[PDB]
Design a protein around this nucleic acid. Structure first.
Ligand SMILES: *C[C@@](*)(O)[C@H](CCCNC(N)=[NH2+])NC(=O)[C@@H]1CCCN1C(=O)[C@H](N)Cc1ccccc1
Ligand SMILES: *[C@@H]1O[C@H](CO)[C@@H](O)[C@H](O)[C@H]1NC(C)=O
Ligand SMILES: [Cl-]
Ligand SMILES: [Cl-]
Ligand SMILES: [K+]
Ligand code: NA
Ligand SMILES: [Zn+2]
Ligand SMILES: [Zn+2]
Lengths: 27, 250
DNA sequence: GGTTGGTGTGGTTGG
């Protein structure tokens, strides 16, 4: 489905300012 | 949101604001799960202890809205509600068990760069992401401290182990709830607060890069207190009820 | 214009 992908971020291959923090908590 | 920061434009396009129609008043947060359905917390619509019991006609929702005060012509959108559905076993008398409601919009909203739905988790998604230590994200227009921002606020917080969540309070916790926040001195702070109920607790999946709503801001005791944790409705645990409503009344 | 038209002592709304 078309959900969970943001036009201004994921679709343009851009990270928002703090998502990296989330990704690192997984490891 | 206590100790969060300003949200960049387009960073939470599934954010929905719930308004009392007359007079206009900002009540709660909510989230967009499809072009015609919005998710929120049941206590935002029904809570007798505060003389609260709304019907469809009494409310409206705003979507794609970045500023509390000005109307961003052709960017934000508005919809009236066709119907409201509260979980049949929502327990407002004791502990807000199953604090969840669906709202069906009168007219589907068109998606844009500022408006898009967030995903709901399935079983493999819930199993690998909902783990003590992993961090999620909460957004909202609620109080900035325990008792009003101009820009949507954002805070990242770690999910906490159930025994800790349970020992931190005397309210009966259930499997339909999970808590999040930092421990007594992990150095950092942050929490949701009153007015943020209904807003989403989301997680970005490291397997397909999509954002999933794992929780709904539900309750707490004070906001951002040392040794206290914010509580959230467990979306996946109540997914069958969600799907049946959409399927039958969609 | 803007992330958005065609006009405002704005507007459902700032400058
Ligand atoms: C309705 C929401 O905006 C709000 C969210 C609060 C989130 N707070 C923190 N720290 N993360 N929820 C509430 O205010 C709920 C509704 C009923 C009262 N409540 C509380 O959270 C009381 N503070 C505690 C409570 C009282 C009765 C039953 C359950 C919880
Ligand atoms: C809320 O109000 C409706 C009528 O508007 C009533 O039928 C419903 O049972 C009420 N819920 C409460 C107060 O438990
Ligand atoms: Cl009333
Ligand atoms: Cl009354
Ligand atoms: K203008
Ligand atoms: Na806390
Ligand atoms: Zn799309
Ligand atoms: Zn009354």
């Amino acid at each position: 489905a078309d959900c969970g992908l943001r036009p201004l971020f994921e679709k343009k291959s851009l990270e928002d300012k703090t998502e990296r923090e989330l990704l690192e908590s997984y490891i | 949101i206590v100790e969060g920061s300003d949200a960049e434009i387009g960073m939470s396009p599934w954010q929905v604001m719930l308004f009392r129609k007359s007079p206009q008043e900002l009540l709660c947060g909510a989230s967009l799960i499809s072009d015609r359905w919005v998710l929120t917390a049941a206590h935002c619509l029904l809570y007798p202890p505060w003389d609260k019991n709304f019907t469809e006609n009494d409310l409206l929702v705003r979507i794609g809205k970045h500023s509390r005060t000005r109307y961003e012509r052709n960017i934000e959108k508005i919809s009236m509600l066709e119907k409201i559905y509260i979980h049949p076993r929502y327990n407002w008398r004791e502990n807000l068990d199953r604090d969840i409601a669906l709202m069906k919009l009168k007219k589907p909203v068109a998606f844009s760069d500022y408006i898009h739905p967030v995903c709901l988790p399935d079983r493999e998604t819930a199993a690998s992401l909902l783990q003590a230590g992993y961090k999620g994200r909460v957004t909202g227009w609620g109080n900035l401290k325990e008792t009003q921002p101009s820009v949507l606020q954002v805070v990242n917080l770690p999910i906490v182990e159930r025994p800790v969540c349970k020992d931190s309070t005397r309210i009966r916790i259930t499997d339909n709830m999970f808590c999040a926040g930092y421990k007594p001195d992990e150095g950092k702070r942050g929490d949701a607060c009153e007015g943020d109920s209904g807003g989403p607790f989301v997680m970005k999946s490291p397997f397909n890069n999509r954002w999933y709503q794992m929780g709904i801001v539900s309750w707490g005791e004070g906001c951002d207190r040392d040794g206290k944790y914010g509580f959230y409705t467990h979306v996946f645990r109540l997914k069958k009820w969600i799907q049946k409503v959409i399927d039958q009344f969609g």
